[PDB]
Amino acid sequence: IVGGYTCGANTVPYQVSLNSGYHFCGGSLINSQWVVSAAHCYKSGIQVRLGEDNINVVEGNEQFISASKSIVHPSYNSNTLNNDIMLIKLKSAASLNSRVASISLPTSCASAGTQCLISGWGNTKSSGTSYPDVLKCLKAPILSDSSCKSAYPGQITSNMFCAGYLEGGKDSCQGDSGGPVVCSGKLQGIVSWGSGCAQKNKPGVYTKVCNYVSWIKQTIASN
Ligand SMILES: NC(=[NH2+])c1cc2cccnc2s1
Ligand SMILES: [Ca+2]
């Protein structure tokens, strides 16, 4: 996250860190047994780490649970990143408490102008590399689809939306992949892609979760 702030330990209780020996993607807890992340974050051998703040220090509120199965969307296209969403089932149910909570799925899509909260442990420099150990947060609005499509001609589908600032300065970045974009108490997006980080007229692109609620609900009830 570039131009954001330190969230505060466990102030984003649904935030997840996917670990395969190191942190490589974020995710969101939707109920005690399931996590939603980005399909481009798919790997075999994932351990989900809940209740984390500093990912390099065991502070006492973490739960490390291995994944029993991963399901990448049936229509994920790695070349265009269309349908960039995946579900991960935990081997054991997590214990929900104040520091580990799940986030709600949306009932309808959010409107341009709505302010959201984006979080993650990704790079904090637009021109450089500095990975933080504690969770960073960024409040950003959803942009109009026309400004999103003008920045990325022929690349945005109806399953994506842009959020951020066209002036540049504040944005999600590498390492933030798979993490949450929460607006009005619902999970509306997943950090998916962009061009550089915090560049002018190059906002971040997010998977539009409101288009996948039926697929999510149906898949978790049959697995
Ligand atoms: N600028 C963004 N919002 C980006 C997010 C990601 C996520 C993965 C890879 N590259 C990028 S750029
Ligand atoms: Ca920790």
Side-chain angles (χ1 to χ4, degrees):
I1 300 286
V2 183
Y5 58 93
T6 297
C7 304
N10 310 130
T11 51
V12 191
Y14 52 82
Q15 172 82 228
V16 161
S17 168
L18 300 188
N19 185 291
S20 51
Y22 46 88
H23 163 84
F24 67 90
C25 276
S28 297
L29 184 70
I30 52 167
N31 70 211
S32 73
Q33 301 179 263
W34 295 89
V35 168
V36 58
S37 183
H40 72 268
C41 286
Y42 169 77
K43 286 186 178 174
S44 205
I46 299 175
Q47 178 183 65
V48 180
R49 294 187 172 218
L50 313 169
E52 289 276 21
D53 182 40
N54 185 312
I55 52 169
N56 275 322
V57 179
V58 174
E59 297 180 283
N61 297 289
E62 307 84 340
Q63 289 177 53
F64 294 166
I65 304 164
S66 285
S68 47
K69 74 187 310 173
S70 292
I71 303 168
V72 164
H73 191 269
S75 313
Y76 170 58
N77 185 314
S78 64
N79 285 146
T80 61
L81 283 209
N82 186 35
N83 301 300
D84 188 18
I85 181 173
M86 162 186 71
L87 289 166
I88 300 170
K89 192 183 190 185
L90 303 183
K91 266 181 60 194
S92 306
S95 301
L96 307 184
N97 54 55
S98 316
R99 302 173 193 244
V100 180
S102 49
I103 179 68
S104 313
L105 292 183
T107 32
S108 50
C109 305
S111 314
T114 301
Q115 290 287 320
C116 307
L117 182 66
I118 307 171
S119 52
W121 288 278
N123 187 15
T124 57
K125 303 283 165 284
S126 358
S127 313
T129 303
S130 189
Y131 277 86
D133 298 312
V134 292
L135 193 69
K136 299 286 169 160
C137 281
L138 169 67
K139 282 177 168 79
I142 294 178
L143 298 174
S144 60
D145 287 311
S146 30
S147 51
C148 188
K149 288 171 177 173
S150 309
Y152 303 103
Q155 296 183 282
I156 306 301
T157 65
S158 46
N159 298 315
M160 307 170 184
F161 71 80
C162 286
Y165 304 85
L166 296 180
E167 71 181 58
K170 289 153 249 66
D171 193 5
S172 51
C173 196
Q174 305 193 181
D176 287 324
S177 300
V181 177
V182 173
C183 327
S184 310
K186 308 277 155 39
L187 177 70
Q188 296 281 188
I190 300 172
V191 177
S192 184
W193 58 281
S195 183
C197 303
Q199 286 177 141
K200 178 181 181 183
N201 298 304
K202 283 298 176 179
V205 189
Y206 306 87
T207 303
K208 193 175 187 189
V209 181
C210 59
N211 287 356
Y212 303 97
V213 178
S214 310
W215 173 71
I216 291 171
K217 293 189 176 186
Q218 188 150 40
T219 297
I220 68 179
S222 304
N223 286 275

